A paper describes a structure:
Therefore, it was hypothesized that the closed conformation (called T state) observed in the structures of type II β-CAs is an allosteric form of the enzyme and, is the inactive form at pH values below 8.0. However, at pH values larger than 8.3, the closed active site is converted to an open one, with an incoming water molecule replacing the carboxylate moiety of the Asp residue, thus generating the nucleophile required in the catalytic cycle. Although the structure was determined at quite a low resolution (maximum resolution 2.7 Å), we could observe that in the active site, the Asp48 is in the same position as in the structure at pH 7.5, interacting directly with the zinc ion. Nevertheless, the active form was never observed in a β-CA structure, regardless of the crystallization pH, except for in two mutants of H. influenzae CAs and a thiocyanate inhibitor complex of M. tuberculosis CA. The X-ray crystal structure of the enzyme was solved at 2.7 Å resolution and two different pH levels (7.5 and 8.5).
Our group recently reported the catalytic activity and the sulfonamide and anion inhibition profiles of the recombinant β- and γ-CAs from B. pseudomallei, named BpsβCA and BpsγCA, respectively. Besides, the bacterial CAs play a pivotal role in the life cycle and pathogenicity of the microorganism, balancing their endogenous equilibrium between CO2 and HCO3−. BpsβCA was revealed to be a tetrameric type II β-CA with a closed active site in which the zinc is tetrahedrally coordinated to Cys46, Asp48, His102, and Cys105.
Author numbering:
A (entry chain A), B (entry chain A), C (entry chain A), D (entry chain A): 7 to 218
Write the structure that this text describes.
């Protein structure tokens, strides 16, 4: 009824009802998240779901290609809020196979504004150029890129003042490079989990585990 | 097994299996989203879910308090990508009752870095000061604030070059101010849906609909 | 000689020589700046000069229309660096009559990207709409706008965590709203100099001093 | 007289008078800048001066360490404004020997917020790690760093959509990596002047010209 998004308000009452086991109360009561999930705006599947947890149990940021810019106060804000105030136990940068962002980059594809944003990802391409070479294919490189991208981003988090300060001040925290396949639902561990400024080794290891 | 996040990889195989109706294929095949959802990092409930749609059918950005800064290339990027390249039909700023961001603001609460980010929301508080007055309570103001916040943010989207250009170039697009209760799952329409630079009227109307 | 910018390297040796009173040594020795100048990229006249001081005696940021965004880590960075580490005594937002930025705004003029940035200034226009009304002219409004713009920006600085923390921690600091005419070289005091969170009064006063 | 900055208003009338050759009129009449100068907030000496030109003849941005972030709408704004609307002929990233920013970086020195901003410069350190090695000294590395930093930043400008589009659309434009000594006033050419997407060669050359 000119509702514009009527369909959506219907699919909504539709949803609201299906949850008879009365508990939006459970949700509204949910307590502190213990995780920050930084992921891609290709919200192919939601975080809590993927990882099988109640919603809101995971604190979420999403930008195109799950990029952490040193100077992005959008994300930094999220992080300082998750760490300093929610005392989340774990931050994890989760990339996703077949990401439209990492694609558009890779194949120097003009998009307009966001080209600027994807430069960040082109940088990872540049950074790991030779490595990405010895995978002379397509999907390999791509896979390997969305992987590398997630590791670097993690380096970014770990270099933040927010995080370094938390470690400085004793607060337990660990930061994970992580990827998931939208194809197979499964979630891959890159062995990228820093906990104290031992990044130099933890990452070198993790990046070794490409070596074509 | 020192997995650090073993629990999470388990709850994962747990999830992966439960989806016997073999279709991660369906997902991987999912086509263009027709919606951009900008919401709060208090990811109390996921967008597609709330609104009853397959995941990835909705394109998502999340920052603390679903703020659209004129000059935030984090979000602007998402938007230029959603509009210009995904030709999404609808953008909608969705706030959420009992948002931790809108709270921390409201009650001038020091948090650290993100205080800077929440200033944006304090601004809406300032902007609609007298209005928010004639609700001399607490939860009212709060409710009314998370509402107003979502409208203003929409004004922000609608003022973007990205959007104005899309309209300029004929491309059909509509932008909605929207809120949902985590208490009752239900989703409220603020009557804030701009489609062509007719904001001045569409919003004045929408903001009228507080008038204590 | 294909130098591309030969002219500039010449006008340079030209400059280098004219400074016989050997003292680039004096400069290289110059000590801490005691001022942060935030001004417009319309660098109509340099700060130190205007204000008659040795160069480098003033620490400088320049963006289009001397805008301080709550979440601009470009400027915030400059400020945290000037205050926390250079212990500058004074920060001052200095606008400038006939500013091309404040103009382009004012007369809703499409420019492209920076339209987004100028929205910040349109906001001040919005914020002080009625005030700016009772100046039914052109240049008045403009004058009055570049003025108001500089005050608001100051409110922005004063609201920063950086500044609030400095005051919190006792460190003496004062923040000034200031304008200069490129026409007459002279520099106007807006009576906008906050020193401790007494903004609410100091600014109300300062903004009164328009009252058409 | 409690003026707070009386000294400054005096040194001002002092300046205003000394310019008897009546011409603030000349200035106010000055026409379009044909240059964008991006430099460091260590405003050791002003651009026009250094380069011997009337003020305002050069359009100026200043951030800590003259960093161009892919996603910094503060600077990008300046650039889109300088290029698209002022049709400046030349953009030039000008670093400066003994820069406090490049220093603080280099010697992983905690400063607070701006540490985040300087990460950008640490990145150049990382990027050119081995190169910077074969200069086993201090001031060498430093010199060589403030140099490299200015080249990379230029790569950043040249990768911008703004610039690429200008070239796309025929508009003549050239981008220069440039450094100046505050010690000796002199300005060094790094042979870094791109004019059309021929960066890959122009820069490789320019970076060769370190080779310890
Ligand atoms: Zn993606
Ligand atoms: Zn929220
Ligand atoms: Zn200006
Ligand atoms: Zn410097």
């Amino acid at each position: 009824p000119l509702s514009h998004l009527f369909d959506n308000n219907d699919a909504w009452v539709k949803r609201k009802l299906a949850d008879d086991p009365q508990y939006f109360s459970r949700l509204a009561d949910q307590q502190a998240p213990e995780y920050l999930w930084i992921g891609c705006s290709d919200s192919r599947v939601p975080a809590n779901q993927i990882i099988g947890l109640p919603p809101g149990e995971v604190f979420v940021h999403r930008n195109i290609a799950n990029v952490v810019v040193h100077t992005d106060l959008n994300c930094l804000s999220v992080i300082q809020f998750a760490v300093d105030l929610l005392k989340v136990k774990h931050v994890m940068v989760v990339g996703h196979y077949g990401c439209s962002g990492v694609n558009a980059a890779l194949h120097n594809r003009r998009v307009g504004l966001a080209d600027n944003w994807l430069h960040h990802v082109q940088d990872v391409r540049e950074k790991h150029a030779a490595l990405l070479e010895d995978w002379p294919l397509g999907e390999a490189r791509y896979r390997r890129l969305i992987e590398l991208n997630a590791i670097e981003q993690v380096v970014n988090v770990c270099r933040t003042t927010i995080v370094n300060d938390a470690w400085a001040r004793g607060q337990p925290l660990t930061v994970h490079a992580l990827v998931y396949g939208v194809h197979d639902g499964r979630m891959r561990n890159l062995g990228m989990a820093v906990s104290h400024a031992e990044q130099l080794d933890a990452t070198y290891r993790r990046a070794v585990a490409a070596l074509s």
